[model samples]
Target: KKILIVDDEKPISDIIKFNMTKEGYEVVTAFNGREALEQFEAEQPDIIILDLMLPEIDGLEVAKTIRKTSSVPILMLSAKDSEFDKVIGLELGADDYVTKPFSNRELQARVKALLRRS
Candidate 1:
C-alpha cells in the first residue's frame, strides 16, 4: 500500500513515515499542501495522511480539491482540538481525522481500518 504523508512540519511527517514504513507500506512525503497535491497526482497514493494546517494551500483546500477528482481516502491530522475543524475536514471529504500528539500505534490502526474499508 502507498501512503502520502503531508505535513509542513518535517519531524511529524518523518515520525509517521518511519512507523508506516516499518509497517510495510510504501510512503511518499510532502511538506506543504501544494506539494501534497502534486504528489497526489504523481504518486497516486492509496491513502493520504494530511495535516490540517499547511503552507500555501492548507489541508482543507487540498482535501476539497482532491475530492473533485478522486475518492482516495484522506485522514486529516491537526493539532487543533476544535470540533469545528474536524467538521470542516469531514465535510471537505476527509475519510477520517486524527488529533495531534497522536499515538503512532493508534494512527496505524486507523489507517489499517480505512484501508480495509476502501
Candidate 2:
C-alpha cells in the first residue's frame, strides 16, 4: 500500500514516514500542498497523511482538489483544535483527522482503520 506524507515541516513528515515505513507501506513525501497535488497524481497513493497548516494552498485545499477526482482516503493532520477547522475538514471530505503531538501508534491505527474501511 502506498501512503503519501504531506507537510511543510520536515520533522513531522519524517516522523510519520519512519513509522509508516516500518509498517511496510510504500511512503511518498511532499513538502507542500501544491507539490503534494503533483505527487498525488504521479504516485496515485491509496492513502494520504496530510498536514492542514501547509505552504502554498494548505492541506484543506489539497484535500478538496483531490476528492474531486479520487476516492482515496485522506487522514488530515491538524494542529488547530478549533471546531471550525474540524468542520471544514469534514466538509471537505477527509476520512479522519489526527491532532498535533499525536502518537505514532495512534496514527498507525487510524491508517489501518481507514484502509480497512476503504
Candidate 3:
C-alpha cells in the first residue's frame, strides 16, 4: 500500500514516516499544502495522512480540492483540539482524523481501517 505523509513538523513527520515505513507501506512525504497536492498527483497514493494546519492551502482546503477530483481517502491530522477542526475536516470530506498527541498504534488502526474501506 502507498501512503502519503503531509506535515511540516520535522519530528512528527519523521516518526510517522518511520512507523508507516516499518508497516511495509510505501511512503511519500510532503511538508506543505502545495507540496501535498503535488505529491498527491505525482504519487497517487492509496491514502493520505494530512495535517490540518498547513502552509499555502491548509488541510481543509486541500481536502476540498482533492475531493473535487477524486475519492481517495484522507486521514486528517489535527494538532488542535477544537471541535470545529474536526467538523471542517469532515465537512471538507476528510475520511477520518486523529488529533495530535495521538497514539501511533491508534493511528495505524485508523489508517488500516480507512485503507480497507477505500
Candidate 4:
C-alpha cells in the first residue's frame, strides 16, 4: 500500500513515515501544502493523511483539489478546536479523521481499517 502524509509539523510526518515504512508500505511525506500537492502529482499515492492547517494551500483546499478527480481515501488530521472544520472536511470528501495528539497505536489502527475498507 502507498500513503502520503502531509503536515507542517515534521514530528508528525516523520513518525507516520517511519511507522508506515516499518509496516512495509510505501510512504511519501510533505511538510507543507505546496509540497504535498507536488508529491500527490508525482507519486499518485494510494491514500492521503492530511493535516488541516498548512502553508500555501491548506489541507481543506488540498482535499477539495484532490477530490476534483481522485477517490483515494483521505484521513484528515485536525485540531480539537476544529470540530467544525472536520465536519466540512468529511463533506469535502475525506473518508476519516484523527484529532491531533493521537496515539501512534490508534493511527496505525486507523490506517489499517481505512486500507481494509478501501
Candidate 5:
C-alpha cells in the first residue's frame, strides 16, 4: 500500500516516513498541497497524512480539493490545537487528525486504524 505524507516541516515528514517505511508501506512525501495533488495523481496513494498548515495551498484547501474528486482517506496533521480549526477541517472532509508533538506509537496506530477501516 502507498501513503502520501504532506507537511511543510522536514523533520515531521522525515519522522513519519522513517517509521512508516519500516512498516513496509510505500511512502511518498510532498511539501505542499499542490505537490500533494500531483503526487496523488501519480502515486494514487492509498491514504494521505496532511498537515493543516502549508506554504502554498494550505491543508484545508488541499483536503477540499481532494474530496471533490475522491474518497481517499485523509488524516489531518497539525500543530494547531484549536476548536475552530478542528471543527472546520473535519467539516471539510478529513477522516482523522494527529496534533503536533504526537508520539510515533499513536501515529502508527492511527494510520493502521484508518487504513484498516478504509
Candidate 6:
C-alpha cells in the first residue's frame, strides 16, 4: 500500500516515513497543502496522513476537496487536542485523526486498520 505523509515539520514527516516504510508500506511526502494536493493528484495514494496546520490550503480544505471525488481514507494529524478539531476533521471526511507526538506504533496500527477496512 502507498501512503502519503504531509506535514510542514520535516522531522515529523521523516519519522512517519521511516516507521511506515519499515512496516513495508510505500511512502510519499509533501511539506505543504498545495504540494500535497499536487502529489495526491499525481500519485493517487491509497492512504493519506495529513497535518492540520498547513501552508497554502490547510488540511481541512484539502480533505474537503479530496472528499469531493475520492473515498480514499484520510488520517488527519493535528497538534490541537480539542474535540472540536477532531470532529471537524471527521466531518470533512477524514477517516481518522492523530494528534501530534503520536506513537509511531499507534499510527501504524491505525493506518493498517484503515487500509483493511477500505
Every model: Cα RMSD to truth: 0.5, 0.7, 0.7, 1.2, 0.7, 0.6
lDDT tens digits, residue span 46-103, model 4: 8999998999998989999988878888999877546687789899888998898888
**Best candidate, lDDT-wise?**
1
**lDDT for every model?**
0.95, 0.92, 0.92, 0.88, 0.92, 0.94
| TM-scores of the models, in the order given | 0.98, 0.97, 0.97, 0.93, 0.97, 0.98
Candidate 5 per-residue lDDT, tens place, 32-116, comes to 8899989998999999999999887999999999999999999998999898988888999999977998999898888899899
Tens-place lDDT digits, model 2, residues 27-93: 9999988899999999999999988988988999999999999999999988887888878897898
lDDT of 3 by residue, 11-95 (tens): 9999999999999999999999999999999999999999988998888888999998999999999887688878888888998
- At residue 106, candidate 5 shows an lDDT of 93
Clashes of each: 0, 0, 0, 0, 0, 0
Q: Candidate 6 on 6-114: residue-level lDDT in tens?
A: 9999999999999999999899999988999999999999999999999999999999999988999999999997999999999989999999889889999999999
* Candidate 3 residue pairs in backbone clash: none
The true-versus-predicted C-alpha distance at residue 94 of model 6, in Å, is 0.5
Which stretch of 10 consecutive residues in model 6 shows the poorest summed lDDT? 98-107
- Any idea what lDDT model 6 has? 0.94
* Residue 38, model 4, lDDT: 92
Order the numbered candidates by lDDT, best leading: 1, 6, 5, 2, 3, 4
Q: In terms of lDDT, which candidate is stronger, 4 or 5?
A: 5
Where does model 4 exceed 4 Å of error? none
Please list the residue runs of candidate 5 whose C-alpha ends up more than 4 Å from where it truly belongs after superposition: none
Instruction: Tell me the TM-score of model 6.
Output: 0.98
- Distance (Å) between predicted and true CA of 77, model 5? 0.5
What candidate 1 gets wrong by more than 4 Å, as runs, is none
Pairs that clash in candidate 2:
none
